[PDB]
Design a protein around this ligand. Structure first.
Ligand SMILES: C[As](C)(=O)[O-]
Ligand SMILES: [Ca+2]
Ligand SMILES: [Ca+2]
Length: 140
């Protein structure tokens, strides 16, 4: 059988009951009424569950979730999206060597984990207001 009144995001279990689809939850384990709702589980809140690993972030979605390397980090496996630690290959991006940085020609790019900084070349001095060791740094 298959109850046809099954609420959204749930699938029939028999002729008089339904079950929330994987990724959703309901108040009762078994839906026996069309008034019951199947709500999205936030996999990123349960701090209990394992992590995405280092340099990553958990992003919740309606019906699922995704792990992504944080800004300043990129996956060596080309896999922009992953599910667990084991799939984590987020390494830091070297904006200086990759020439992706945007330091004033008057400065020298210095790479850091997750970011990067522009420093004053020796014998040079920072312009006014703006300080050194920064992405907006400028020297004269
Ligand atoms: C993509 As949907 C509205 O079936 O959760
Ligand atoms: Ca979710
Ligand atoms: Ca970096």
């Amino acid at each position: 059988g298959c109850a046809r009144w099954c609420p959204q995001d749930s699938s029939c279990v028999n002729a008089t009951a339904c079950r929330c689809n994987p990724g959703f939850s309901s108040f009762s384990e078994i839906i026996t009424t069309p008034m019951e709702t199947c709500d999205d589980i936030n996999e990123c809140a349960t701090l209990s569950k394992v992590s995405c690993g280092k340099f990553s972030d958990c992003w919740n979605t309606e019906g699922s979730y995704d792990c992504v390397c944080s800004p300043g980090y990129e996956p060596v496996s080309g896999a922009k999206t992953f599910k667990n630690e084991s799939e984590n290959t987020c390494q830091d991006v070297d904006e200086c060597s990759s020439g992706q940085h945007q330091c004033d020609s008057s400065t020298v790019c210095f790479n850091t984990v997750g970011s990067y900084s522009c420093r004053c070349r020796p014998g040079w001095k920072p312009r006014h207001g703006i300080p050194n060791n920064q992405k907006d740094t400028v020297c004269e």
